[PDB]
């Protein structure tokens, strides 16, 4: 039971991340919070490094960028991450149409396995 | 702490929806959920004049006979509706698209 409010810029940015590319791509919303009342009004791309057949996220990448984002958007926070990608499948994906996966509020912070973390549901 | 996994056919309807119009809309989400996973698959556009309450029931029924492997799970709106400049340009402005999952009453207000 909760209110997501999702603004086009958010969408805008992970399907252009999307566009702009191992088949996932991840990245990382802010916003604001209030009760079950979440805003996600903004986001960033996490880099990856692809270490054989692993995707791994990229550590200091990910801090030097919250870091700038908070500095920037100081009344917004990590909120958590998204993610989207790759017969009938086949012809959705083609035309770029999957879901975009949205975690909000995860339990870690951590970038870590995050591809595993997500993929746990 | 919750997972939605969005389809994009959703935020097309809503779009659809909004841009098909002549200052809110509103309609219901369809999709299916485990634990804090919810995923967000299709939609339907609620007929107003105040929610048009048989309207609403019979859309829902047919969206149970097609996709039955799916259930209400909540409500979206959107659209030009504090700031006193955010109410001046608000029709050039981006608008948010407010979803509304798993609401306690399934009853149509808002």
Redesign the interface.
Same mark, same amino acid.
């Not at 039971?1 to 810029?9: D, E, M, N, Q, R």
């Not at 149409?97 to 339990?107: G, R």
């Given at each position: $039971?909760?209110?997501? $409010? *999702?603004? /086009?810029?958010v =969408?805008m940015n992970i399907s252009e991340h999307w566009t702009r590319f191992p088949r996932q791509v991840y990245g990382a919303l802010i916003g604001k919070q209030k009760g079950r009342n979440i !805003?996600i009004m903004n986001s960033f791309e996490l880099k990856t490094d692809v270490i054989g057949d692993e995707t791994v996220i990229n550590k200091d990448y990910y801090n030097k960028k919250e870091q700038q984002y908070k500095q920037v958007f100081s009344d917004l926070d990590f909120i958590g991450w998204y993610t989207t990608g790759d017969k009938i499948q086949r012809q959705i994906a083609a035309i770029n !149409?999957? /879901? =975009?996966? *949205?975690?909000?509020? /995860? *339990?870690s912070r951590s970038v870590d396995h995050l591809p595993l973390k997500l993929f746990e $549901?």
């Open positions: $039971s909760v209110t997501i $409010s *999702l603004h /086009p810029l =969408i !805003e !149409e999957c /879901p =975009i996966m *949205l975690q909000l509020n /995860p *339990l $549901s």
